[PDB]
Design a protein around this ligand. Structure first.
Ligand SMILES: Cc1cn([C@H]2C[C@H](O)[C@@H](COP(=O)(O)O)O2)c(=O)[nH]c1=O
Ligand SMILES: Cc1cn([C@H]2C[C@H](O)[C@@H](COP(=O)(O)O)O2)c(=O)[nH]c1=O
Ligand SMILES: Cc1cn([C@H]2C[C@H](O)[C@@H](COP(=O)(O)O)O2)c(=O)[nH]c1=O
Ligand SMILES: [Cl-]
Ligand SMILES: [Cl-]
Ligand SMILES: [Cl-]
Ligand SMILES: [Cl-]
Ligand SMILES: [Cl-]
Lengths: 195, 196
């Protein structure tokens, strides 16, 4: 089996990339794709508390998402890995680190500690990082008007966080057209699976 | 202000003690007594998921206790302390350490890290540990319920073992005494702290 996660800042083309790569991999491997909380009832119920929050404390939000993450891991991801499947996951611990730990300023070490408690040693075997520049990412988001200056700065912080976070990681140049980003990611995964 | 928590295994007389101490302190202090989630809506919703759980993973449970703990802390305890009140809290971080960490086996250090994230440095000013022996505790449990099965007896013993390690801020009160004495000792311990 293999636990592969996909990471990247806003405008990295990640959604398009993971779905196209998944569709291509299903043809040659016993693989599934999921995105937290992956439809896991308890995971959705915990997440609902955050979605209905009003000025909810950011640490409370982080712990609830961490709890939801573990439900998804123990009820969906782990059983699938035990069945010998390759599991592709759209975002995981690195997203929490880059967004909550770095960008939101909770603290990298604090959020890392929270992440570790939630995953209990289950790290990705491979993590694809869709490395997009702030400028291209911005345009892609706009492509999909203009963006607020506050958002632009947060966008930059998220990217800065991923840079610091990044053997587990394999970066793909996400500044290229999506077609190429897909091909590069697919090839990176095949190389890993065939090693 | 003063943030005073109460800790102890089952059968330690904790409910009776906090209530009686509260009624004595309120004459002279601007005090409140609370428990997590303590009426805080989000804390209530979080706690509800744990109660309705079916063989819930212990780490998920720990994180929910921690999330509820923070909502109660930020939305109820801190505002009270800011008003300069004495806050009596029935269970706090040490309960997670003893139950989730030690007794359930997640690990005290791991659960401590999780809870330090949750309380962000806000530790109790004073923590009353109602030190009851496994045997006296058992009898009180049977009362408030006969006989207890081995599984529950062992768990109770393990929780006590965990607390012993944790307290090895803390003020121990001998909870093997009649409740009247446990209450008096606890009250005197608190007054000594409040007047210093
Ligand atoms: C704060 C937080 C948000 N999220 C998600 C849910 C939201 O769709 C998105 C943006 O949330 P935010 O506006 O609170 O930063 O990120 C997590 O997955 N984990 C977290 O800890
Ligand atoms: C999974 C995850 C997402 N997020 C955020 C960042 C993304 O903007 C959003 C999900 O967007 P996405 O569906 O395009 O990946 O939620 C966090 O802040 N923390 C997390 O742990
Ligand atoms: C506050 C807290 C309580 N508990 C449990 C242990 C107790 O049996 C129960 C509360 O019971 P009590 O109201 O009689 O003290 O909840 C935990 O396991 N972890 C915690 O962090
Ligand atoms: Cl790159
Ligand atoms: Cl394109
Ligand atoms: Cl209450
Ligand atoms: Cl004692
Ligand atoms: Cl008595």
């Amino acid at each position: 089996s293999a636990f592969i996660t996909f990471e990247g800042p806003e405008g990295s083309g990640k959604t398009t990339v993971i779905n196209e790569v998944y569709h291509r991999l299903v043809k040659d491997y016993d693989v599934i794709m999921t995105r937290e909380p992956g439809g896991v009832p308890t995971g959705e119920e915990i997440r609902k508390i955050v979605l209905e929050g009003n000025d909810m404390d950011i640490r409370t939000e982080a712990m609830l998402f961490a709890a939801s993450r573990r439900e998804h891991l123990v009820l969906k991801v782990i059983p699938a890995l035990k069945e010998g499947k390759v599991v592709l996951c759209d975002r995981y611990i690195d997203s929490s680190l880059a967004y909550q730990g770095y960008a939101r300023g909770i603290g990298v070490e604090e959020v890392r500690a929270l992440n570790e408690f939630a995953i209990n040693g289950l790290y990705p075997d491979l993590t694809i990082y869709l490395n997009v520049s702030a400028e291209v990412g911005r345009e892609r988001i706009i492509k999909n008007n203009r963006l607020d200056q506050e958002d632009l700065k947060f966008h930059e912080k998220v990217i800065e966080g991923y840079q610091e976070i990044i053997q587990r990681f394999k970066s793909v140049n996400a500044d290229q057209p999506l077609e190429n980003v897909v091909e590069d990611t697919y090839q990176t995964i095949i190389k890993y699976l065939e090693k």
